[PDB]
């Protein structure tokens, strides 16, 4: 019954910059008794600050903890590449222990439009009675992107599954896959299939499309 709100949800950073992550409690002068944890993907959290002002024994002195009762901040005096991770802040003042929704720390790069690719059903999947149309949207920045499927100019939402990667380790871009799965029989009663992305880098949708009748 004690909410802890973290802002911002995401923060794009360049190294050397000083970043401040903010946290706010809904109740109490929850005193100090606030902690920050860092979690990289596929790993357990690791502790950084205990009581909101103390570094645990291994954390570099670029990490700083501040604030009391209702407002707290975590501070990195010059962010380094190894500081990319999610940052959680938790309060130990009251039971049950509550953690805030995290803050994602991502590397900043220049904006990049998706490279978009569309693939009709393989002939081996057609012979099994299935039909997946797959769309790749690769190497874009920033991460926000919306994709729509269109069948003969009409939008389709059912049968669509999406996956996305995290930020790439070299180019720092994001990529995305979107799959429209149909039965073979509904697949062959339509002509045109198109995926279109809306992204910051372009003022029009980025379109890829094929038509079963154009050979």
């Amino acid at each position: 019954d004690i909410v802890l709100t973290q802002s911002p949800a995401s923060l794009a950073v360049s190294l050397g910059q000083r970043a401040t992550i903010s946290c706010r409690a809904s109740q109490s002068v929850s005193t100090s008794y606030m902690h920050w944890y860092q979690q990289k993907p596929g790993q357990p959290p690791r502790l950084l600050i205990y009581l909101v002002s103390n570094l645990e024994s291994g954390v570099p002195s670029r990490f700083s903890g501040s604030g009391s009762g209702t407002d707290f901040t975590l501070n990195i005096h010059p962010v380094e590449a190894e500081d990319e991770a999610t940052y959680y802040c938790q309060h130990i003042r009251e039971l049950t222990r509550s953690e805030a929704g995290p803050s994602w720390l991502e590397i900043k790069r220049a904006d990049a439009a998706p490279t978009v690719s569309i693939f009709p059903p393989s002939s081996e999947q057609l012979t099994s009675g299935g039909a997946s149309v797959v769309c790749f949207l690769n190497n874009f920045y920033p991460k926000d992107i919306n994709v729509k499927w269109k069948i003969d100019g009409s939008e389709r939402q059912n049968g669509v599954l999406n996956s996305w990667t995290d930020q790439d380790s070299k180019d720092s871009t994001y990529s995305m896959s979107s799959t429209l799965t149909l039965t073979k029989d509904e697949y062959e009663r339509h002509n045109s299939y198109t995926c279109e992305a809306t992204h910051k880098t372009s003022t029009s949708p980025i379109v890829k499309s094929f038509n079963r009748n154009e050979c």
Partner: protein, 218 residues
């Protein structure tokens, strides 16, 4: 050297029960409480409760009451978490963490993933995805590999046995009919393909299958 080591990953079906162990080394087990925390795959950390190390007594958050149990084996410095009547939304990673009282938790175990579902082990169908007209931009051309209907995870997808790492995107699997699918794309200069062979490789160790699908022009 303080260390919390948890037991391995577990696959269970709905209504089963699972027990997860957390073994502490490098400190006096009875001088610190032990906490348990659930992470959903999306999703932010959620505290389930804690157990008094000395008295072996559980305290549970309201959302974790009645279907969960904390226990100890003090002589062996391990804490246990047991989940009864497993439901679908118990699919998550579960962590143990050493309690430091009013200051919360400090050391964390590596986590244990738990999957609940009714499917049986199933090998994937693997589909090569050859480009069509607009799948070249500039010099480069994008090819794909679609891996559909397997259980359980993981699969390992590589291209030409890993020699083709440089321009690959392999996407996390997503569920579908309680089965998994992933896709992977690889981008190469249009002057290596189709003149040079490109083959995606899928390994699914739970079903002992290993399959290659060469991408051939439409």
């Amino acid at each position: 050297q303080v260390q919390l080591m948890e037991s391995g990953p577990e696959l269970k079906k709905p209504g089963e029960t699972v027990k997860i162990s957390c073994k502490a080394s490098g400190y006096t087990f009875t001088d610190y409480s032990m906490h348990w925390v659930k992470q959903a795959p999306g999703k932010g950390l959620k505290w389930m409760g804690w157990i008094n190390t000395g008295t072996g007594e559980p305290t549970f958050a309201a959302d974790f009451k009645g279907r969960f149990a904390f226990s100890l084996e003090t002589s062996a410095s391990t804490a246990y978490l047991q989940i009864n009547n497993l439901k679908n939304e118990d699919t998550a990673s579960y962590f143990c963490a050493r309690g430091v009282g009013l200051y919360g938790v400090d050391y964390w175990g590596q986590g244990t993933s738990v999957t609940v579902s009714s499917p049986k082990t199933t090998p994937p169908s693997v589909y090569p995805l050859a480009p069509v007209c607009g799948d070249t931009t500039g010099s480069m051309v994008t090819l794909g590999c679609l891996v559909k209907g397997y259980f359980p995870e993981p699969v390992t997808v590589t291209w030409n046995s890993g020699s083709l790492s440089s321009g690959v995107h392999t996407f996390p699997a997503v569920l579908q009919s309680d089965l998994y699918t992933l896709s992977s794309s690889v981008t190469v200069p249009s002057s290596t393909w189709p003149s040079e062979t490109v083959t995606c490789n899928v390994a699914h160790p739970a079903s002992s299958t290993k399959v290659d699908k060469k991408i051939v022009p439409r």
